[PDB]
Design an enzyme around this catalytic site. Structure first.
Site, PDB file in Angstrom:
ATOM      1  CG  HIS A  20     143.702  47.876 146.974  1.00 61.07           C
ATOM      2  ND1 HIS A  20     142.778  46.972 147.458  1.00 61.07           N
ATOM      3  CD2 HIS A  20     143.084  49.083 147.005  1.00 61.07           C
ATOM      4  CE1 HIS A  20     141.658  47.601 147.762  1.00 61.07           C
ATOM      5  NE2 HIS A  20     141.819  48.887 147.496  1.00 61.07           N
ATOM      6  CG  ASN A  68     138.635  54.692 145.889  1.00 60.74           C
ATOM      7  OD1 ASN A  68     139.108  53.560 145.881  1.00 60.74           O
ATOM      8  ND2 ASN A  68     138.502  55.396 147.002  1.00 60.74           N
ATOM      9  CG  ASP A  93     142.357  43.684 146.836  1.00 57.44           C
ATOM     10  OD1 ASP A  93     141.874  44.239 145.818  1.00 57.44           O
ATOM     11  OD2 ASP A  93     142.520  44.286 147.917  1.00 57.44           O
ATOM     12  CG  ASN A 114     136.033  52.539 148.759  1.00 60.61           C
ATOM     13  OD1 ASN A 114     134.811  52.539 148.941  1.00 60.61           O
ATOM     14  ND2 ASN A 114     136.895  52.859 149.715  1.00 60.61           N
TER      15      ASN A 114
END
Length: 193
Positions: A20, A68, A93, A114
């Protein structure tokens, strides 16, 4: 032209090598090659730097808000320097591309990411910013996605992602000197021919 390059990530050594954080790996590479260290600025909720790329003045940002909540940092930087959404490139990613491949895209949705979702929201529900999609592969179904994106890739996959990031950096520089069309044609040909 591009005035701001953002690399999505989660802060801290705990998440540094996870999938991530692929966007941050890209921004780190640019800063390293130019010897222009990123420094955290509270005002912008993330690490920032200023570099010269292809002769142009470009700012770098890696949010420290947690994934987020990324929109907050991008919006703060864009508002202070008065940068339009289409003058922003967000590296992230991408589950829909395999390790070793990367692609540019303008607009579109968040596709379930997100970090992208929050950026679209904070820019005033505007998805019209550029993206560098760094392939990480897909585990098979949605139930396995959480542990996958927050997991560290095996050495062989890491080598492939590193290659794509290196090529993406050269093509981003090309974008400034030769234009987006030429830069896109070169990047999308990587691993395809």
């Amino acid at each position: 032209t591009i005035k701001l390059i953002v690399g999505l990530a989660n802060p801290g050594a705990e998440y540094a090598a996870t999938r991530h954080n692929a966007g941050a790996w890209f921004v780190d590479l640019l800063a390293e090659r130019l010897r222009a260290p990123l420094r955290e600025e509270a005002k912008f909720f993330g690490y920032t730097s200023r570099v010269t790329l292809g002769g142009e003045d470009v700012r770098l940002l890696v949010p420290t808000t947690f994934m987020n909540l990324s929109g907050k940092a991008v919006a703060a930087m864009a508002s202070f320097f008065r940068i339009n959404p289409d003058e922003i490139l967000v590296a992230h990613d991408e589950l829909d591309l395999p390790p070793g491949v990367a692609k540019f895209k303008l607009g579109g949705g968040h596709g379930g990411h997100n970090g992208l979702k929050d950026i679209i929201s904070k820019l005033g529900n505007n998805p019209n910013f550029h993206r560098l999609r760094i392939g990480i592969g897909h585990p098979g179904d949605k139930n396995k996605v959480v542990g996958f994106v927050l997991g560290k890739p095996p050495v062989s996959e890491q080598k492939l992602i590193d290659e794509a990031i290196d090529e993406a950096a050269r093509c981003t520089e090309m974008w400034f000197t030769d234009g987006l069309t030429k830069a896109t044609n070169r990047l999308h040909a990587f691993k395809a021919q």
